[PDB]
């Protein structure tokens, strides 16, 4: 244990940017914290970055102002920052740095772990199996995704992905009521709702939405506005990540961590780069974006021996539609599979604007079948797949050809598009959607042909719905 | 005490001996007591970024210690007059001289301290009484159209000592001493607050209040709020005058831009002239307005710090309690400046240049906004919004800034490059823009005319069935046809190049929801294959004649002499030669 | 790119003038 | 005034290019003036540009060649760079130091004044209302201009831009003669003319045509060749700039300022960054250049109390016929408007080739209307130049499919590009137009549509003029 007092100075040499250097520094230590006291009595805190023997330097936090060269004074805490961690946060709101703002205290943590977190045993791994409810139909229905599966949300500026967030956070659910409801007693789900970088009206949006649904017993809500410091917006995922640990490994749950606005991380990314004098890379941004990125997204799966799981869906602001954006990629290189919206659809006013056409989810073969679910769920979304995909070739071909030309299973085809963005498509802002019944509007909407064109399903499974 | 020069280059000193003084704080230079702000300290060396013109100095000058940090004196005298980055009381400053011509070095305070102004305390003012950081001392009658007052700034309380009587009291005449712990003090009725650090408030409330913007086809299309962000590339400035006249808002706070004189000198000559009606009186003059303006001659500090001390200074009105708006001609000049300023502190720039501190810096200069609760008397509320951009270089979406601007402010306004090159200034790619708000306007919409909610749906599908069809015409039927004309049409009819006659400056928007309306139930009609009981696009092209003619004069009315009613009628007109055209197919 | 580094190196070899 | 002894120095610690470092130097003044003395005796001149402690640095006007670290003498005059500056240059002929060269005497000066001239306080600046008479079609009516206006002429290598420059400046007269003719011709127009980076042939060509009008009782010229020097064109314009103001501001006159080939002062002014080691900004160029263009560029406009007037024509290349360049682009940030001669209009043989589609005048709001040019002006240029745009789309939709689409309107708009070209565009060397008389062209070109097609006019002043 720490049994060593802190220590005090008052000499320095200057400060640099939002950089503070100083001297005569006994045995520095790197990635130590330290707050700092102004004239006027204002404190501060800061982290080091730079040490070369004697000479310190560190940023700080809250940003550098009315800093005097002889009446100010850091004081070292001799440590690394240490994440006060435990189970009680849920049903808490925190700030950037964790300093509560639900007009709540202290947080009395049980444990104290490192902010940067370790990596997992890549031998210590299991191969994602069941699914998770999110409550949206264009989700669950074709790309639903898994234990430990990551999947990002590409979308662009000026687009409702928060709200479309806001509504997952307050209707994401398992699905142990399938095998009973009396199963479903075991509420270990949990949610971490991380928003960085956030117009303070959408936080305001965020927190009255979460407080009307009264659902923030398993809720753990960490929010950081634009305006606060830069080098605390690198600090609240380390933060999310460690709590989301602790619950699903130590506690043995299973959270659904969720992030924002990663572009605006790479932004604070690129904002420590320049305060660490390292010659930019390819458009910019630093060339090792790769590694953390890296380090933030594998934090999740399933272990052995263990009761629980962690699924991250991060949400990704496509700059101007540039697909061969470096950010982007090694998102999509990283995780596995992607979500699309659309732009068009949000103009058409169906919401939420989810395109399907391009979606892709990668380890859905396994995360649904027989036992876990319905049998044909696979098979439904490849049939709706399939048949959107013919309808909008029929369209195509429609827009210039025109209806004297046109038969009758085109017409079907027509009917059945329509009816699909109109019907399954549309979601509304408060509708709690279940498996159950999104399998059974998706057969009503298949009902529509008869047998002879639904090919691609063996008759001995069309058998179970086909004539009802 | 003071100290020495170093010796020196381009906009910036460099001075031995300043160890001691805090580096974001103020300093004199040199024997003309040149302004500057200190912006590196190493060691007793520092160098030191200066504001006016920076020839004619010597090493080794003196170097007066430095005052407070940087600040802007406030309180009656304001929405009066005219001032520029550092608060120059320039209409001061001609008579000063009696030539004008050279501005030289001068040292004038903003306020006139030789003019004297009546102040009644509020009654509830009691000796011995307790005063928190947001009560109202008492009324000032300032001028004509509105009267702001004054409060205690964010201190604690403390038992009043002394509190003057009413009367006319001329430049400080020191209106009330307090008492605190151990600490007996003056107050004037001016006070000076710092820049670039703005005071707080209780609580932020929830925006729900219609904008009468100024201008069609904004808000026809893409609504804002009364306390809200907004981004408008400047490819003008007619927009807030519109609002002056139309919008609730009491004050708006033009900021120059510098990059261009002329319009400047225009806008300076024009102001007096500004003619409307407040409660049925003939308000000739807006003279109720704070205009700040700085030319590209000045040097860059300058051209940094003016958005700031017009920000201060909006701030500190609608912490009075009135709902007031903004209007910024920068975002192109800011971001050089601040590219500039970066070069010359020698550290790498990104990849197109800015630096780092664009992102955060123009986040934080922005958001500062929204309705108000207010940290004393509970009366106050107030509220401000923003509204301003810059013609990116080239129509560059992917300039650093946009990509700032979309993502902290959240009504974008388009403006394609391929119809901007052809002097459509009220042009826009729509493809690029977003829509703040839909549910701000639900209320509004129940109450007053609710049936626009679909027809601008029905407008959009128009505007990407164009977007899709000009590529087919690239490379046809008379179906697709249809959407086009109408497309066409609407967009004759809406991007309206009027050139700024005065004939386009008006907005009622209950008289031009109609010709929307119109377009819309024409394409309605004719999109049934064009046969109502379905004929080609070209068979009513050529029923219709002089129709189309007219519909698309409809634009040229001057609803000042035309009269509302007679409006409505010519509406009317319109509607019935459509179901009479049409009845005859 | 070139040009940056080019400069970033003057600067550091400015630096270790003492 | 200074009433002390001069100083001098020997002290030389090196020469970088067309810089000159120095040390132990007392009490320096930044921007001072220096005199130089060779060992072969030649006399020299220069500017300092850095200071630091006891070394400073200058910069040679006309380069270092035969300088010595021991052998050369350097002379401190501690004032700032004073000009001479009288009504007597007019007639006269000098190079860019300002020495004569037209065999003429040395300068005998009025006054002293400064090359930074002086910060103009805005509130004086009178708004421009009067629009001057060019005489070429495409300016008139079409992107008028006025005087005080600012406007530039962007060109490129081998156009023919140089007589444009010719044509704008003979043909100089007001378009206010509906009123007695006498008191018109009072009016005159004194030219100062500043070469800059411009060859023997194109010098004598414009002195030439300056002897052929017979104006040079009003005509100041400064000249530079391309054998001469290459820092002497950072301090040429100013000079010039600041004889128009003493020109204008205090002899009363009417004058009109032309400046040659801005991208040689960018050049050298990159040069000197070069030299300077100094952060760079993009294609090399420093960047505070932005900053020295508004310097250059705002010495314009008339003032009250006073009558007099100065018009910005400055003539500027863009390589590789490129709009993205930056000095075009930064030009375009200070100057209010644009021309943009073409190459492609070159190429047939129509002069002179102005494209009309880029180009901008913003301050003809106000500059016309009735009583100032005609009650109908500005929308018929607008009813023309929207005409015109769209007769560009049919020509381009003729070029990627071909006549056997186009229908009868795309004949009547190819037919209005071509008589457009014709007649309103080619003007001739010596072809002075009258405003009514391009009016009534305009008129003309309308004609040939009849009342349906035009768009953007009203319908009252169609009755009003279109029959007749």
């Known amino acids: ?187 270990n789900f949990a949610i971490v709702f991380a928003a960085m970088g956030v117009n303070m009206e959408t936080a305001r949006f965020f927190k009255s939405d979460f407080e009307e649904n009264g659902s923030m017993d398993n809720v753990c809500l960490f929010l950081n506005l634009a305006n606060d410091p830069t080098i605390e917006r690198i600090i609240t995922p380390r933060l999310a990540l460690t709590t989301a640990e602790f619950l699903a490994y130590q506690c043995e749950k299973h959270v659904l961590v969720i992030l924002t606005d990663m572009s605006s991380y790479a932004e604070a990314l690129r904002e420590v780069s320049a305060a660490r004098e390292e010659v930019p890379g390819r458009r910019g941004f630093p060339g090792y974006m790769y590694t953390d990125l890296a380090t933030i997204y594998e934090r999740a799966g399933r272990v052995e021996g263990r009761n629980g799981s962690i699924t991250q869906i991060p949400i990704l602001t496509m700059p101007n539609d540039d697909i061969t954006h470096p950010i982007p990629d090694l998102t999509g290189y990283i995780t596995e599979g992607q979500i699309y919206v659309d732009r068009q659809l949000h103009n058409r006013q169906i919401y939420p604007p989810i395109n399907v056409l391009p979606s892709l989810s990668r380890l859905m073969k396994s995360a649904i079948g027989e036992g876990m679910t319905r049998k044909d769920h696979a098979d439904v979304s490849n049939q709706l797949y399939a048949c959107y995909a013919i309808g909008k070739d029929v369209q195509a071909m429609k827009a210039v050809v025109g209806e004297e030309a046109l038969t009758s299973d085109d017409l079907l ?15 509304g802002p408060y509708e709690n959607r279940t498996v159950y019944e999104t399998l059974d509007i998706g057969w009503q ?24 | 005490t003071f100290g020495y020069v170093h010796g020196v280059s381009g906009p910036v000193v460099t001075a031995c001996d300043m160890a001691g003084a805090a580096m974001y704080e103020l300093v004199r230079v040199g024997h003309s007591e040149l302004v500057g702000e200190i912006i590196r300290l190493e060691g007793d060396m520092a160098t030191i970024q200066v504001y006016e013109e920076t020839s004619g100095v010597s090493v080794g000058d003196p170097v007066l210690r430095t005052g407070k940090p940087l600040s802007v004196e406030l309180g009656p005298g304001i929405m009066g007059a005219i001032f520029d980055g550092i608060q120059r009381p320039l209409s001061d400053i001609s008579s000063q001289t009696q030539s004008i011509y050279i501005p030289r070095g001068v040292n004038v305070s903003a306020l006139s301290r030789d003019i004297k102004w009546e102040f009644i305390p509020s009654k509830n003012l009691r000796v011995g009484s307790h005063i928190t950081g947001g009560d109202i001392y008492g009324i000032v009658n300032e001028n004509s159209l509105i009267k702001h007052k004054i409060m205690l700034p964010p201190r604690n309380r403390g038992s009043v000592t002394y509190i003057a009587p009413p009367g006319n009291y001329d430049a400080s005449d020191v209106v009330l001493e307090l008492e605190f712990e151990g600490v007996k003090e003056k107050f004037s009725m001016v006070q000076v607050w710092p820049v670039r650090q703005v005071r707080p408030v209780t609580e932020k409330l929830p925006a729900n209040h219609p904008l009468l913007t100024g201008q069609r086809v904004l808000d026809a299309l893409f609504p804002c709020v009364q306390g809200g962000t907004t981004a408008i590339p400047g490819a003008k400035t007619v927009i807030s005058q519109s609002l002056s006249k139309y919008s609730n808002s009491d004050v708006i706070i033009y900021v120059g831009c510098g990059e261009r004189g002329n319009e400047m000198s225009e806008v300076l000559r024009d102001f007096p002239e500004l003619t409307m009606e407040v409660d049925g009186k003939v308000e000739s003059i807006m003279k109720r307005t704070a205009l700040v303006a700085n030319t590209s001659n000045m040097p860059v500090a300058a051209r940094e710090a003016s958005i700031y001390t017009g920000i201060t200074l909006s701030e500190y009105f609608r912490d009075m309690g009135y709902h007031v708006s903004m209007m910024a001609d920068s975002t192109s000049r800011w971001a050089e400046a601040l590219r500039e300023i970066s070069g010359r502190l020698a550290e790498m720039p990104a990849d197109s240049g800015y630096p780092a501190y664009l992102g955060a810096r123009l986040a934080s200069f922005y958001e500062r906004a929204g309705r108000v609760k207010c940290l004393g008397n509970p009366e106050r509320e107030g509220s401000v919004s923003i509204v301003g951009a810059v013609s990116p270089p080239g129509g560059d979406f992917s300039d650093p800034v946009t990509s700032a601007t979309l993502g902290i402010v959240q009504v974008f306004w388009g403006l394609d490059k391929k119809l901007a090159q052809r002097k459509h200034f009220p042009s826009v790619n729509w493809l690029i823009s977003y829509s703040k708000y839909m549910r701000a306007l639900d209320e509004y919409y129940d109450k007053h005319f609710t049936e626009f909610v679909p027809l601008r749906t029905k407008a959009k599908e128009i505007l990407q069935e164009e977007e899709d069809l000009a590529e087919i015409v690239q490379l046809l039927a008379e179906t697709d046809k249809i959407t086009l004309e109408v497309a066409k049409l609407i967009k004759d009819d809406f991007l309206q190049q009027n050139g700024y006659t005065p004939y386009d400056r008006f907005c009622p928007f209950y008289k031009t929801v109609g010709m929307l309306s119109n377009m819309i139930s024409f394409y309605d009609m004719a999109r049934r294959a064009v046969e109502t009981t379905a004929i080609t696009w070209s068979i009513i092209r050529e029923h219709m004649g002089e129709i189309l003619y007219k519909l698309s004069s409809m634009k040229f009315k001057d609803p000042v002499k035309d009269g509302e009613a007679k409006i409505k009628a010519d509406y009317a007109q319109l509607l019935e030669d459509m179901q009479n055209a049409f009845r005859s197919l | 790119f070139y040009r940056l580094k080019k400069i970033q190196e003057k600067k550091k070899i400015i630096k270790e003038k003492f």
Chains 1, 4 share one sequence.
């Open chain 1, 1 to 187: 244990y720490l049994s060593q007092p802190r220590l005090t100075y008052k000499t320095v040499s200057g400060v640099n940017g939002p950089l503070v250097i100083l001297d005569h520094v006994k045995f520095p230590r790197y990635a130590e914290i330290v707050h700092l006291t102004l004239p006027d009595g204002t404190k501060r805190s800061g982290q080091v970055l730079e040490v070369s023997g004697s000479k310190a330097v560190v940023q700080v936090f809250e940003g550098t102002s009315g800093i005097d060269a002889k009446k100010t004074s850091c004081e070292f805490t001799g440590d690394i920052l240490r994440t006060p961690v435990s189970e009680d946060m849920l049903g808490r709101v925190f700030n950037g740095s964790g300093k509560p703002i639900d007009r709540g205290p202290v947080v009395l943590a049980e444990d104290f772990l490192d902010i940067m977190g370790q990596p997992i045993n890549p031998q210590c791994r299991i191969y994602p199996e069941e699914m998770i409810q999110t409550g949206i139909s264009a989700i669950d229905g074709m790309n639903s995704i898994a234990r430990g599966q990551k999947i990002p949300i590409f979308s662009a500026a000026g687009l409702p992905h928060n709200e479309i967030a806001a509504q997952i956070c307050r209707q994401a659910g398992l699905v142990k009521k399938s095998k009973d409801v009396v199963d479903y007693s075991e509420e």
């Open chain 1, 413 to 427: 085809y027509l009917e059945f598009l329509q009816k699909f963005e109109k019907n399954f498509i549309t979601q």
């Open chain 1, 445 to 468: 909407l298949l009902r529509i042909f008869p047998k002879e064109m639904l090919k691609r399903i063996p008759q001995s499974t069309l058998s179970e719905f086909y004539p009802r």
